[PDB]
Amino acid sequence: PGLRVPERRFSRVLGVGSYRPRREVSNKEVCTWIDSTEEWIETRTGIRSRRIAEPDETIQVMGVAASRRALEHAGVDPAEIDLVVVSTMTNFVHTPPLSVAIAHELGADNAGGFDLSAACAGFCHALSIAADAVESGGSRHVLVVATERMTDVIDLADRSLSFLFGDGAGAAVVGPSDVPGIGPVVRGIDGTGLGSLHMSSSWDQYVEDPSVGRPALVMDGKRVFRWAVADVVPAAREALEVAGLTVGDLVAFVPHQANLRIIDVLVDRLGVPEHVVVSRDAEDTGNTSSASVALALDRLVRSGAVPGGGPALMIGFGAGLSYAGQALLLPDPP
Amino acid sequence: GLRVPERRFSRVLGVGSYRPRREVSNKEVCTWIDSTEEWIETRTGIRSRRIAEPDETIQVMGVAASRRALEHAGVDPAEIDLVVVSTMTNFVHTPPLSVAIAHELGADNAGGFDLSAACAGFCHALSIAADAVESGGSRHVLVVATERMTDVIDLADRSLSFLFGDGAGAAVVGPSDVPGIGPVVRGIDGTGLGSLHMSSSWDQYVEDPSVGRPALVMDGKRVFRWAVADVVPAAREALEVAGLTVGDLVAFVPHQANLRIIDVLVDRLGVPEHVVVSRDAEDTGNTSSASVALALDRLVRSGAVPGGGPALMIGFGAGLSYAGQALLLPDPPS
Ligand SMILES: *C(=O)CSCCNC(=O)CCNC(=O)[C@H](O)C(C)(C)COP(=O)(O)OP(=O)(O)OC[C@H]1O[C@@H](n2cnc3c(N)ncnc32)[C@@H](O)[C@@H]1OP(=O)(O)O
Ligand SMILES: *C(=O)CSCCNC(=O)CCNC(=O)[C@H](O)C(C)(C)COP(=O)(O)OP(=O)(O)OC[C@H]1O[C@@H](n2cnc3c(N)ncnc32)[C@@H](O)[C@@H]1OP(=O)(O)O
Numbered sequence A: 001p002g003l004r005v006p007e008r009r010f011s012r013v014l015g016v017g018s019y020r021p022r023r024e025v026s027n028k029e030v031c032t033w034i035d036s037t038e039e040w041i042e043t044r045t046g047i048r049s050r051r052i053a054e055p056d057e058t059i060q061v062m063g064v065a066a067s068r069r070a071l072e073h074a075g076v077d078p079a080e081i082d083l084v085v086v087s088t089m090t091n092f093v094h095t096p097p098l099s100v101a102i103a104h105e106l107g108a109d110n111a112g113g114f115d116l117s118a119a120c121a122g123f124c125h126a127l128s129i130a131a132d133a134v135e136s137g138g139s140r141h142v143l144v145v146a147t148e149r150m151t152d153v154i155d156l157a158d159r160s161l162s163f164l165f166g167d168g169a170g171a172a173v174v175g176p177s178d179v180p181g182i183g184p185v186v187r188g189i190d191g192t193g194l195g196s197l198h199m200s201s202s203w204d205q206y207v208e209d210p211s212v213g214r215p216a217l218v219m220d221g222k223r224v225f226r227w228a229v230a231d232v233v234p235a236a237r238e239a240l241e242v243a244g245l246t247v248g249d250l251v252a253f254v255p256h257q258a259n260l261r262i263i264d265v266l267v268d269r270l271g272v273p274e275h276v277v278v279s280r281d282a283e284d285t286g287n288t289s290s291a292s293v294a295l296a297l298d299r300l301v302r303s304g305a306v307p308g309g310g311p312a313l314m315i316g317f318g319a320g321l322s323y324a325g326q327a328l329l330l331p332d333p334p
Numbered sequence B: 001g002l003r004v005p006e007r008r009f010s011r012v013l014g015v016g017s018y019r020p021r022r023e024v025s026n027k028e029v030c031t032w033i034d035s036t037e038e039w040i041e042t043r044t045g046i047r048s049r050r051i052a053e054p055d056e057t058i059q060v061m062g063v064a065a066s067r068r069a070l071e072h073a074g075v076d077p078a079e080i081d082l083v084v085v086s087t088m089t090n091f092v093h094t095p096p097l098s099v100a101i102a103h104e105l106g107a108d109n110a111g112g113f114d115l116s117a118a119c120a121g122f123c124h125a126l127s128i129a130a131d132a133v134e135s136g137g138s139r140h141v142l143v144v145a146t147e148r149m150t151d152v153i154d155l156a157d158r159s160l161s162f163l164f165g166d167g168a169g170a171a172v173v174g175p176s177d178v179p180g181i182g183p184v185v186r187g188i189d190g191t192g193l194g195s196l197h198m199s200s201s202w203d204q205y206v207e208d209p210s211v212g213r214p215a216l217v218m219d220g221k222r223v224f225r226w227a228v229a230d231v232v233p234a235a236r237e238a239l240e241v242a243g244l245t246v247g248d249l250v251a252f253v254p255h256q257a258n259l260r261i262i263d264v265l266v267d268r269l270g271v272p273e274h275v276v277v278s279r280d281a282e283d284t285g286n287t288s289s290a291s292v293a294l295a296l297d298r299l300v301r302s303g304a305v306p307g308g309g310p311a312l313m314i315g316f317g318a319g320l321s322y323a324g325q326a327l328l329l330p331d332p333p334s
Helices: A061-074 A098-106 A119-135 A222-244 A259-269 A291-301 B038-046 B060-073 B098-107 B118-135 B189-195 B219-241 B259-271 B290-302
Strands: A010-018 A025-026 A047-052 A082-085 A112-117 A142-149 A167-177 A184-190 A198-201 A217-221 A250-256 A311-318 A322-331 B009-018 B023-025 B048-050 B082-086 B111-116 B140-150 B166-176 B185-188 B196-198 B216-218 B252-253 B310-317 B321-326
Touching: A010 A047, A010 A061, A010 A119, A010 A291, A047 A167, A047 B185, A061 A098, A061 A167, A061 A291, A082 A098, A082 A119, A098 A112, A098 A142, A098 B185, A098 B189, A098 B196, A112 A119, A112 B185, A112 B321, A119 A142, A119 A167, A119 A184, A119 A291, A119 A311, A119 A322, A119 B111, A119 B118, A142 A291, A167 A291, A184 A222, A184 B098, A184 B111, A184 B219, A198 A311, A222 A322, A250 A259, A250 A291, A259 A322, A291 A311, A291 B166, A311 B082, A322 B111, B009 B118, B009 B290, B009 B321, B038 B060, B060 B098, B060 B166, B060 B290, B082 B098, B082 B118, B082 B259, B098 B111, B111 B118, B111 B216, B118 B166, B118 B290, B118 B310, B140 B290, B166 B290, B185 B219, B189 B196, B189 B219, B189 B259, B196 B252, B219 B259, B219 B310, B219 B321, B252 B259, B252 B290, B290 B310
Parallel strands: A082 A112, A082 A142, A250 A311, B082 B111, B082 B140, B252 B310
Antiparallel strands: A010 A167, A025 A047, A112 B111, A142 A167, A184 A322, A198 A217, A311 A322, B009 B166, B023 B048, B140 B166, B185 B321, B196 B216, B310 B321
């Protein structure tokens, strides 16, 4: 009674997809909500425009749309999906899990599903869970969806970060591969950051004293910026070594679109060559939280700017002050 | 990335729990709703449950259960590579509870993320931990299921106020020489979304009182019928993919929805007389994802069963979904 010796295997991203809210919002329109200047929102962040979800574009709608596109690219039917993992931090329904409603809508009635909550690092955590699942021999096809409506958790009328977070969703399908297509994940924390990226309040408080009402992100952007340059850079190189790869091996670098500036710093401290394509979707996407790396990944692969099978470095980082990232073989363009 | 890492096997090395100090008998329950002790016990098997006080927040409960598991496993917080927290009663969008818990615990060398899958949460987390360890990328993983079901039930509503309790349970998983955790089985029934869901989302709360704070609403009979139809075959599947029959079982740890369902599961499943079946609901009530963790901690610490013995664990509920697996039990502590 020593159990069965399951037969592992290899896995990698078979297909990617995404959903981008129809309503685009330029910095000019953002300056009509807050007291800013299109010119500040760009030299500091790097955003020229972001997309904001409309009432009908719930995270479920966006997640199912992003998922379908991923399944089409991978050429996999919903019936073949064994697990659906949804990463989000902007869900106001305690239960049942969003991942179960998405699976059901998609037609994947053979699947299970949890939701996952890890702030910006969410997609890279979900992806490593998917990789481990398939490689364990227990699952063959896994769907990973990162759907966020950050606008629901941020006061647009708050120059703090009202020009920062965008909406949208990204998905990836992982399945069998003859060779390792996803490198080991690397993850870590700062526990002293809890006060750098928290919620104005908890819904529990909202009901007891309305005074501090509806929850919403508040951030000490200097501390996180320094944390990002301090720990995210080393993690990125670790993510590289653990997978047996160097900066020069990459054909792409898809970091969470927190800020083009931080992105410049990262690309800088990391020694990223000029030949390796770097995601900067933040320009017109904004900051989409855990969906950020997924949205970017989808754009990258579907551009032709990079060939299949080539190494790509991904890494999300943020709230709680925690990161997660891994290196992976890009899929063939659709 | 191309690099074949070294796989190992994993098992549960320690288990722990935190049970709120306040015990609430059916008699006290009946002073909150129009009901009787006879009715409650006859319909659920529950005689008493523990209700968390203001100071026993899910983070407090999670930390305490985690320290018991770590103590039992003889593992240092510094040795923890991942912290997975399962919970559906968290009113804080970010940062992740897991990160807050990992910090207070002392495990600053870990990352982690929150998991949300209603009653199936602990089993999904366990399969993530087993996979992480077995993949070679992590050596020790901490899984914590912590809940205050009382925070999302009315307490005055006659329909379910006598079913939930609060509490947390945890488990440490690490390397083993032989497979110590079977493959996870999981599935859903999406047409059952309307049988167990929230009275409203915080979104709808923020827009109109009354509406109340999001509270749990389910269809006894529908959930019970689905569990009997789908969970009995899932339980058998869990044994099969691990290469076991029900007779090699020393224990059965089903989610404690209530003892009447468990009674049917045991009967339909054909669990032999020699197997210990957790019936913790009798004094614990239903604690959602923490149900199985609490029952496992109690089982192991009872001294009724030996380390190494096969145990079947399965959680089931929202919405609808389940996840379960077989595993080799830890030696009881001392
Ligand atoms: C996943 O979990 C989530 S992502 C967490 C997202 N954040 C990041 O990813 C990290 C982002 N790091 C930062 O955001 C940086 O904090 C900033 C640059 C984007 C914000 O600006 P700064 O940090 O440089 O500094 P701040 O002191 O807050 O502002 C400096 C002065 O700027 C002036 N100013 C001008 N116009 C604006 C507007 N329109 N918004 C806010 N104010 C701006 C004044 O704000 C500041 O003061 P001063 O001019 O009197 O010195
Ligand atoms: C993880 O993700 C989630 S777990 C949370 C949901 N899951 C679980 O809770 C476990 C599911 N448990 C159940 O299925 C139970 O098996 C029940 C709820 C189905 C037990 O309820 P019954 O079917 O036996 O009752 P019902 O037919 O709806 O009502 C029958 C009569 O009961 C009378 N009555 C008397 N006292 C009470 C009190 N305390 N509460 C509610 N009603 C009571 C009246 O209820 C009904 O009419 P009648 O008695 O004249 O026929």
